[PDB]
Amino acid sequence: KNVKSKIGSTENLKHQPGGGKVQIINKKLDLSNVQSK
């Protein structure tokens, strides 16, 4: 067996399930609430 699990398993994360990352600040969701005048 030079054949087995493969590396397809790696693919599971190459796709990066859950495109929003904890970086949801990615859109910079947190506003300093610069309401200003």
**Complete DSSP assignment for 6-34:** -SHHHHHHHT-SSSS-TTGGGTT------
Question: What is the torsional sign of CA 10, 16, 21, 23?
Answer: positive
Method by which the model was determined: NMR
Given the structure tokens 């200003």, which residue do they identify? 36
Question: What is the torsional sign of CA 29, 31, 35, 36?
Answer: negative
Return d(Cα 9, Cα 4) in angstroms, integer.
11
Do the beta carbons of residue 20 and residue 26 sit within 8 Å? yes
Do the beta carbons of residue 5 and residue 11 sit within 8 Å? no
